[PDB]
UniProtKB/Swiss-Prot annotation, chain A:
Cellular localisation: Nucleus
Protein name, per record: Mediator of RNA polymerase II transcription subunit 14
Domain of life according to the entry: Eukaryota
Subunit comment: Component of the Mediator complex, which is composed of at least 21 subunits that form three structurally distinct submodules. The Mediator head module contains MED6, MED8, MED11, SRB4/MED17, SRB5/MED18, ROX3/MED19, SRB2/MED20 and SRB6/MED22, the middle module contains MED1, MED4, NUT1/MED5, MED7, CSE2/MED9, NUT2/MED10, SRB7/MED21 and SOH1/MED31, and the tail module contains MED2, PGD1/MED3, RGR1/MED14, GAL11/MED15 and SIN4/MED16. The head and the middle modules interact directly with RNA polymerase II, whereas the elongated tail module interacts with gene-specific regulatory proteins.
Species, as recorded: Saccharomyces cerevisiae (strain ATCC 204508 / S288c) (Baker's yeast)
Family: Belongs to the Mediator complex subunit 14 family.
Swiss-Prot record, chain B:
Compartment list: Nucleus
Taxonomic lineage from the root: Eukaryota, Fungi, Dikarya, Ascomycota, Saccharomycotina
Job description of the protein: Component of the Mediator complex, a coactivator involved in the regulated transcription of nearly all RNA polymerase II-dependent genes. Mediator functions as a bridge to convey information from gene-specific regulatory proteins to the basal RNA polymerase II transcription machinery. The Mediator complex, having a compact conformation in its free form, is recruited to promoters by direct interactions with regulatory proteins and serves for the assembly of a functional preinitiation complex with RNA polymerase II and the general transcription factors.
Residues of the full protein shown: 639 to 687 of 687
Protein family per UniProt: Belongs to the Mediator complex subunit 17 family.
Name the UniProt record assigns to this protein: Mediator of RNA polymerase II transcription subunit 17
Subunit structure, as described in the record: Component of the Mediator complex, which is composed of at least 21 subunits that form three structurally distinct submodules. The Mediator head module contains MED6, MED8, MED11, SRB4/MED17, SRB5/MED18, ROX3/MED19, SRB2/MED20 and SRB6/MED22, the middle module contains MED1, MED4, NUT1/MED5, MED7, CSE2/MED9, NUT2/MED10, SRB7/MED21 and SOH1/MED31, and the tail module contains MED2, PGD1/MED3, RGR1/MED14, GAL11/MED15 and SIN4/MED16. The head and the middle modules interact directly with RNA polymerase II, whereas the elongated tail module interacts with gene-specific regulatory proteins.
Taxonomic superkingdom: Eukaryota
Additional information: Present with 1720 molecules/cell in log phase SD medium.
């Protein structure tokens, strides 16, 4: 079980590091397993959204996804 | 869906009983606050004219 958990975490970290290398998601200092995506909620607002990786099946998910956000998360999956 | 919040706003200006000035839906509280501020500003302007 520990070996499987280590492999899971390593694969997730490798994918996250590739995404950071592509410089699409900024780095989250508070959480090493949370990716920050910059999106403007309004004309002047410019806010980050937290995307997380499922440790079991590995599909990206949002913290409070809107219907469009959920649809595009499914598209990402 | 027992978890998401949907806010339906119906603002009827003082013109007719059935002439609904605006009828919108919102899923983001930030947009709710923005539209509330806009409605308050519009009402203030109407009171100023």
């Amino acid at each position: 079980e520990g070996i499987l958990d280590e492999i899971m975490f390593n694969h997730a970290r490798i994918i996250r590091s590739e995404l950071l290398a592509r410089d699409i998601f900024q780095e989250d200092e508070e959480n090493s397993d949370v990716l920050l995506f910059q999106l403007p909620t309004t004309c002047v607002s410019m806010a980050p959204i937290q995307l997380k990786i499922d440790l079991l099946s590995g599909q990206f998910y949002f913290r409070n996804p809107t219907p469009l956000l959920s649809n595009y998360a499914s598209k990402i999956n | 869906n027992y978890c998401n919040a949907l806010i339906h706003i119906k603002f009827s200006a003082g013109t007719e009983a059935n002439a609904v000035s605006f009828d919108t839906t919102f899923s983001d509280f930030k947009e709710v606050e923005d539209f509330l501020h806009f409605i308050v500003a519009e009402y203030i302007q109407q009171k100023k004219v």
